[PDB]
Each structure stands twice: as structure tokens, then as C-alpha cells.
Design a binder for this molecule. Structure first.
Ligand SMILES: Nc1ccn([C@H]2C[C@H](O)[C@@H](COP(=O)(O)NP(=O)(O)OP(=O)(O)O)O2)c(=O)n1
Ligand SMILES: [Mn+2]
Ligand SMILES: [Mn+2]
Ligand code: NA
Ligand code: NA
Length: 323
DNA sequence: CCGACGTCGCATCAGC
DNA sequence: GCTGATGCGA
DNA sequence: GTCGG
């Protein structure tokens, strides 16, 4: 419908982030691309698009050029640019951001092939990102996500039956596919007022049954790694997937569950309705805003519905949280 | 005009 | 060796 | 790049 415009803006967004290192221009282009993608008409002019929140003068100008020529001169130019295109591409490797990609291209390292010839110049994360470059860019069918959930909940309960684990993200919202697996973990012995090994014992077990295959980062509260479903007999093996496991205190668990379930826009909207009701919501707590704007102590939470009631909101199932 | 634009855990770097 | 900054992907 | 105080 407006795919040409949105693809154009998305591509401009990446070059800003990865090449120009302008994170705010990156978000600006993506916000404009998002608001246009939801627009239910084929855009006839830049002036028409400028009415949308996130589309200003510059983008309205760029849209006019695209509509009249079928392309953007600047975008066509940076596409052909060997240095810029290589920098932007290298950032597709997990662990290689704008800064690392810049350094690599500066010293002649421009392709995955070049990265493969230069392992010693890559850190642990970047090696894993390189190894699973293809797998990481694939999506995960819900059926596989269900099998992944089966393993996680089973092994977690096996370590300690008092653990509470919840797979959040787009999966919990009931999406037909997901980009990764977000696991939230808590235990009755862990509160805010509070063992340093609650997360480790879970990771260890998942590694023992060969579910977790690699580790990108691991601390006392947050694990980021790689997992893979078991090979079904003599059939083709499953792609490696990204998995995060977060250990959250019991009293902050459901604010965490609410947040990490999403979606992006839903959180933004829910934070807005909360503020107009005199409440502030982060990933940890929900707090009442005093008469002068001072935030008081965090209110007790025992479920998602508690937060919904606090701001006088009708509870919405994760299924209906796309926005 | 000009500052905000989310904030943070972990790995690793820079400086001392 | 320690501390704070930076990069990175959330 | 866009918005808004
Ligand atoms: N911009 C962001 C990023 C993260 N989040 C918190 C809520 C997002 O819905 C959520 C989970 O992040 P995510 O996995 O990167 N995105 P999401 O699960 O919606 O998409 P997939 O990666 O599962 O395809 O974390 C947020 O509210 N806003
Ligand atoms: Mn996710
Ligand atoms: Mn995620
Ligand atoms: Na990257
Ligand atoms: Na990337």
C-alpha cells in the first residue's frame, strides 16, 4: 500500500543508526515508517503524509521525490557506497554495532567472509553472532516456541518446584511467530528487600539437557544466550534461537511480566493512561504521583490485573495488546 | 531556538 | 588491580 | 528528523 515509502524510510533509518551513528534520527525515521504503515490510504503527496505525527518537512520532501521519480537520490547514492553499505551490513551480526562495524571496514574487513578470516579480532559475542548469522535472522514458528516453552518450564520446575517462570514477549501475546524467547524468572526467596545463584542453577540445567548451546552474557539477574530444540530423529535440525532469561524479585515480577509482554505501543499507551491517572509505571514498579509530582513508595502488586485496577483500566488479555 | 528523544545489565575498554 | 566509561542489545 | 516548551 505504502510499502515503497516505508521500505525507503526503514532503509534510511538503518544508515542513520549504523553509519551516521545518529540514534535519534534512526528512531525518527522508524516512527514515521510506523505511522505510515498503519495509514489506510495510498499516499498521494508529502503534504498528505505530513499530517501524521512523526512526519515532518524533510520526510514530506523525500516522499514527494519518491512519488515522482520512484527513488531517492541520496538513498541510491549511499547504497552504491562501498564503505557505507559494508558498515551497515556488518551491523547485522549480533555483537557488531555501529562502532565495531566502522573499525572493521576501516581495516578492510567488509564481509562475513572477511570476519571468518579474522576470528581473533572478534569478541565472544561477535563470534557467536557470526556463527549463527543466518539462524538469528529467522523467525520462530509458534509450534516451535511451544516446544521451547515445554522444555524451559519443565527444567525450571525440576531444579526447584517453587520457581515461577513465564515466557513473555510476542509469544505470550499469541503471535504466530516470534523473533526470540523472553523468559522471566522469580522465586519466593527473592524479593527487593532481599540467593546469588538462583539464575545460574537454571542456566546450568538447561545447558545440561543441551537446550542452551551458547552464552552471550550472564550475570546474577540477566542471561542472554542461544538455544536449540532437539533434532527430531533423522530430520533436519532446528535453527539456533536467541533466548533471554531474567531473574526478577517477587514483588517486581508482574510489572516485569506486564512490560516484557508488550507490545511496544501498548506499553507506551498504558504508560500514558497511567500518567493521566496520577501513576507512573516502569518495568519494576508502579508508583502514585503526589500533589507536587513527587513519586511515593511502590504499590504492592500480586498480578497483572492489580496494575490494571490501580489505573482504573479494564484488564486486557495479552492476546489484545498489539496496541 | 534548542533540548528531548527510555533506561539498564553485562562485557570490555580506557585511564589511573 | 580498581573504577568509571563505552559499546551493545535489549 | 520531529516535536514542542
Ligand atoms: N521498544 C521496546 C522494546 C522492548 N519492550 C519490552 C516490551 C516489548 O514488547 C518487549 C519484548 O521485546 P522483543 O522480544 O524485542 N519485542 P517482541 O517480543 O514484541 O517481538 P519479537 O522479538 O518476539 O518478534 O519488551 C518495550 O516495551 N519497548
Ligand atoms: Mn521477543
Ligand atoms: Mn527480546
Ligand atoms: Na549487530
Ligand atoms: Na543489528
Amino acid at each position: 500500500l505504502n510499502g515503497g515509502i516505508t521500505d525507503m524510510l526503514t532503509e534510511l533509518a538503518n544508515f542513520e543508526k549504523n553509519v551516521s551513528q545518529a540514534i535519534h534520527k534512526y528512531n525518527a525515521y522508524r516512527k514515521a515508517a510506523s505511522v505510515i504503515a498503519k495509514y489506510p490510504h495510498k499516499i498521494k503527496s508529502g503534504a498528505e503524509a505530513k499530517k501524521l505525527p512523526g512526519v515532518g518537512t524533510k520526510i514530506a520532501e523525500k516522499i514527494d521525490e519518491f512519488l515522482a521519480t520512484g527513488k531517492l537520490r541520496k538513498l541510491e547514492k549511499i547504497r552504491q557506497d562501498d564503505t557505507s553499505s559494508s558498515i551497515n551490513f556488518l551491523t547485522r551480526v549480533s555483537g557488531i554495532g555501529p562502532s565495531a562495524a566502522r573499525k572493521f571496514v576501516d581495516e578492510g574487513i567488509k564481509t562475513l567472509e572477511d570476519l571468518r578470516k579474522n576470528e581473533d579480532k572478534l569478541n565472544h559475542h561477535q563470534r557467536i553472532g557470526l556463527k549463527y548469522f543466518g539462524d538469528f535472522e529467522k523467525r520462530i514458528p509458534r509450534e516451535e516456541m511451544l516446544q521451547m516453552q515445554d522444555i524451559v518450564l519443565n527444567e525450571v520446575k525440576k531444579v526447584d518446584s517453587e520457581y515461577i517462570a513465564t515466557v513473555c514477549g510476542s509469544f505470550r501475546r499469541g503471535a504466530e511467530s516470534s523473533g526470540d524467547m523472553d523468559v522471566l524468572l522469580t522465586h519466593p526467596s527473592f524479593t527487593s528487600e532481599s540467593q546469588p545463584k538462583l539464575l545460574h542453577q537454571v542456566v546450568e540445567q538447561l545447558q545440561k539437557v543441551h537446550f542452551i548451546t551458547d552464552t552471550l552474557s550472564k550475570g546474577e539477574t540477566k542471561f542472554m544466550g542461544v538455544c536449540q530444540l532437539p533434532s527430531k530423529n533423522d530430520e533436519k535440525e532446528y535453527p539456533h534461537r536467541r533466548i533471554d532469561i531474567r531473574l526478577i524479585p517477587k514483588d517486581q515480577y508482574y510489572c516485569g511480566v506486564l512490560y516484557f509482554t508488550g507490545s511496544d505501543i501498548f506499553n507506551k499507551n498504558m504508560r500514558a493512561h497511567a500518567l493521566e491517572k496520577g501513576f507512573t509505571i516502569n518495568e519494576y514498579t508502579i508508583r502514585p504521583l503526589g500533589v507536587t509530582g513527587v513519586a511515593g513508595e511502590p504499590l504492592p502488586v500480586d498480578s497483572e490485573k492489580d496494575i490494571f485496577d490501580y489505573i482504573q483500566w479494564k484488564y486486557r488479555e495479552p492476546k489484545d495488546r498489539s496496541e
